[PDB]
Amino acid sequence: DTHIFIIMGASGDLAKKKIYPTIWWLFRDGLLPENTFIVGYARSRLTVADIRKQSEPFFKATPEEKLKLEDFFARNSYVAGQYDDAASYQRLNSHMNALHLGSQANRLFYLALPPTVYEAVTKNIHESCMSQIGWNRIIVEKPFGRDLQSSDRLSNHISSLFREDQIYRIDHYLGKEMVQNLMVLRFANRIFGPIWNRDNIACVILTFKEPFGTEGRGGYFDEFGIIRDVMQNHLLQMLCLVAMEKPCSTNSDDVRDEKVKVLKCISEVQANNVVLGQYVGNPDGEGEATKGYLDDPTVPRGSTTATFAAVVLYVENERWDGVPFILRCGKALNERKAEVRLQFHDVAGDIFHQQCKRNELVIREAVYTQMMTLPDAYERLILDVFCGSQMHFVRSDELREAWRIFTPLLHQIELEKPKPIPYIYGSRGPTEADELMKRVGFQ
Amino acid sequence: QSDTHIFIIMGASGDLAKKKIYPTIWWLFRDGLLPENTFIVGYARSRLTVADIRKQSEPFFKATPEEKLKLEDFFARNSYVAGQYDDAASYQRLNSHMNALHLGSQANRLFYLALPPTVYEAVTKNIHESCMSQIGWNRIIVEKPFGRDLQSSDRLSNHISSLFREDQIYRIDHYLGKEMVQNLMVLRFANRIFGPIWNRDNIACVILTFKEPFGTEGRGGYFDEFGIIRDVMQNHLLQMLCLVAMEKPCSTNSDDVRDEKVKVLKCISEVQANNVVLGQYVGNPDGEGEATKGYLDDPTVPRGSTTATFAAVVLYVENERWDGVPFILRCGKALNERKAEVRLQFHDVIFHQQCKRNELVIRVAVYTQMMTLPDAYERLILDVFCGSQMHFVRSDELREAWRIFTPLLHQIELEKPKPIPYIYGSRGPTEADELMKRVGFQ
Ligand SMILES: NC(=O)c1ccc[n+]([C@@H]2O[C@H](COP(=O)([O-])OP(=O)(O)OC[C@H]3O[C@@H](n4cnc5c(N)ncnc54)[C@H](OP(=O)(O)O)[C@@H]3O)[C@@H](O)[C@H]2O)c1
Ligand SMILES: NC(=O)c1ccc[n+]([C@@H]2O[C@H](COP(=O)([O-])OP(=O)(O)OC[C@H]3O[C@@H](n4cnc5c(N)ncnc54)[C@H](OP(=O)(O)O)[C@@H]3O)[C@@H](O)[C@H]2O)c1
């Protein structure tokens, strides 16, 4: 029953503005397990007072909650420590053992540090802090490398120290309906699976659009680009949920095993199935929509970093083969959308004596077929690791195959630095995206 | 082989010929959808002339002055022969009158049986024995009723199918509106697209609805002899089920798809009296129009009538693909709207929170939803010219159809139960929505 929630880097913005508040909300709605201590670790010489002061801004505290807020802060504590230094972890372990049932408690470690220090911490948590009786679960944060080779080093490290069932790689930086995406597509597989195949579907597009640009933090993004930001992780996860086979059960590792069989059968995307974009500002429109990506302090000058990407993948296997899977995601477009389109073959020529137009299944609140021509993301991902559900967290093999697919392309965008086709903030994207789609059988 | 066509309206004197058949061939001539060389010969006991038939029909033709040139050209090709229905002499005259037309000899002949099915036996016998072209094809259109039950249907069926081949027999049904072939075409399309889904592994409950917003519209006396189950369920709604529940056909031929339809029927068991709710519409005081007037306030409806004007019924397809999957048929006159829709509800179960049953809804693009030029008659007439039997009930399709509803129908005649009062423009009786919940229709 008893749980300890340890935030490493409890001083930083992620802990301050996101982690502390989102476990506040979770405890404030009786969603946390009854007996749950929150514990902060960092270098800074802080107390429970310092950490209410800096972090209650983002809590959205009211007059009626004044009693609960104090019951939450009764169960918090802090511990000074270098991330480099063993005795620091030794002090932390003993702190937790002293707490009520602290010797028997399950332990949930949130790594809210940069991945440069990840090696040191995994090795020290592993050496000194693991429960002898409870479960031990590490929440590791993006980025999980920037390429196959770098992701393979950081990962092979964590996975020599931690079983796969103690590793939770979290992704939440693409909005609060981001888990919802993964649940309806998984549901739409259970309903429509028998129809989702090459004998019924001529084309699939997975669209993920953000209407807003990189709004000042383009200094963190210019290191990564859109393929690493959205495509390699989220779109690919939603591709898998569409192309996978009804799983052997409803257990995390049976569906994860099925998302990987897809990924294994996707070969390395080459550059002439790729259309990259970059958002140049809008003269003709109000708000931050006047600011091109380039025109931002944090973005280096003449940086040829992709803001938009359209890609053609193929899932070379008996179920799908020659069925083009189109991935289309971008910043600073005309709307906020996550849609999958499954365009059928022209199957009604005889019935209606005329040439009838093409049919198509669309998912975005039951969704539809046409004819062309409270728990919110972060909240739900926290509970999932308290509940031991790894459904929505990427696996080791899953993550390697992900990078295997895009890594040759990405190294070519570093070496040869091509120029992203510019496109107006608010527009649908480069029009060479629409052409690529037509040439591969989109309507 | 040839380009010429004779259209023989047996009972051209009659009310169907006047208000529907002449108009609907007129409109087809008006739009050049008929063959270039089409003669139109009417036959009945009445001593009439083309001008007599012109005068009674032309009110229904809704003719404009632009069409007068086209319309003389039409009534030109019109002839009329008087004659009795079991008098061999008479039929001789008709054969001769056709033979005395340009290429009658080797023209295709199309016989519209616009008579009550009491003269069918003699009219069919005599057409076979006398009036059939010997180079051209010979096709018969038979009108409803296709008898009133299995035994009455089988007798007429057997007779006709001892004289004519199944490929000469066209059983036309066209009294349930204009988007009525449409209805059938789109449930076939969706079958093509959603077939692999449509089965007991994936689907909890199937429901096919046929609502009309109006009553018997003064012609209650005709309806009262038949009931809602003979008028809608045993014909058009049972075809909509066949089209949903049937196997990937072995080809895109009439006879192949109709084979697959019959396979579903063969496996449908006799509908049981305690899986049936019957309605009859009483008037709407607060309403206005015909909506003021109930079934029994039709002056042609005999007093004390219990004829069902609405019915819910529950069938099962007992085979592999379906089983413990109730098919619910719900139809009626004088209802809240005009609807022909199929609902397929899936099984209930990712969202760690009871998330409510989903269901696929084909209304006549349509959708999944989380719950809680030509018209029918023109098309069907063309279909017999152009030779397609796709949208016409095959003899054995029809035998099964009667087999399913015949025990219940006879139960209804014997026990004479009191159908439930439902207000004109109502949804139908509540006891219908109860039946559905007990078999799990959400
Ligand atoms: N889209 C994204 O993927 C995205 C967006 C937001 C955040 N993040 C993730 O957030 C994580 C943490 O960021 P944050 O917002 O919490 O702030 P941060 O300032 O990057 O790091 C948080 C804390 O870590 C410690 N720290 C920082 N740099 C360090 C270094 N070089 N060596 C040792 N300790 C160091 C500091 O705590 P003390 O000095 O007090 O010990 C600092 O307050 C990163 O891993 C990043 O990947 C990424
Ligand atoms: N909703 C429906 O299902 C529906 C509705 C309309 C029609 N129908 C069907 O359409 C067919 C014809 O309908 P209708 O309204 O045109 O019928 P009808 O007017 O009663 O019969 C048409 C012609 O048949 C002849 N006739 C009538 N009763 C006869 C009898 N007992 N014996 C011999 N000849 C007789 C008369 O011509 P002569 O005296 O000049 O020979 C009459 O002009 C029927 O089979 C009917 O069931 C179906």
Author numbering:
A (entry chain B): 30 to 393, 398 to 406, 433 to 502
B (entry chain A): 28 to 376, 380 to 394, 399 to 406, 433 to 502
What does the publication say?
G6PD exists as a monomer, homodimer, and homotetramer, with each monomer having three binding sites: one for catalytic glucose-6-phosphate (G6P), one for an NADP+ cofactor, and an allosteric NADP+-binding site. The latter allosteric NADP+-binding site, also known as the structural NADP+-binding site, is important for maintaining long-term protein stability and for promoting oligomer assembly.
As G6PDK403Q has been established as a good model for Class I variants, we sought to determine if stabilizing the dimer or tetramer could correct activity or stability for G6PDK403Q. Using the same mutagenic strategy described above, we made double and triple mutants, the G6PDK403Q mutation combined with either dL, or both dL and tetramer-locked (tL), to determine if inducing oligomerization could recover activity and/or stability for G6PDK403Q. In contrast, locking G6PDK403Q in the tetrameric state improved activity significantly, ∼200-fold. Consistent with the fact that tetramer locking was able to activate G6PDK403Q, G6PDK403QdLtL improved G6P and NADP+ binding significantly, as the Km changed from 1382 to 102 μM for G6P and from 802 to 59 μM for NADP+. Interestingly, the G6PDK403QdLtL dimer recovered the missing ßM strand of the structural NADP+ ß-sheet, lost in G6PDK403Q. Additionally, the globular shape of the dimer is modified, with a hinge-like shift in one of the monomers relative to the other monomer in the dimer (salmon to teal). As A277C is located at opposing ends of the αj-helix, tetramer locking through disulfide bond formation likely prevents the αj-helix from shifting, which maintains the K290/E287 and E347/K275 salt bridges, reducing shifting of the structural NADP+ ß-sheet.
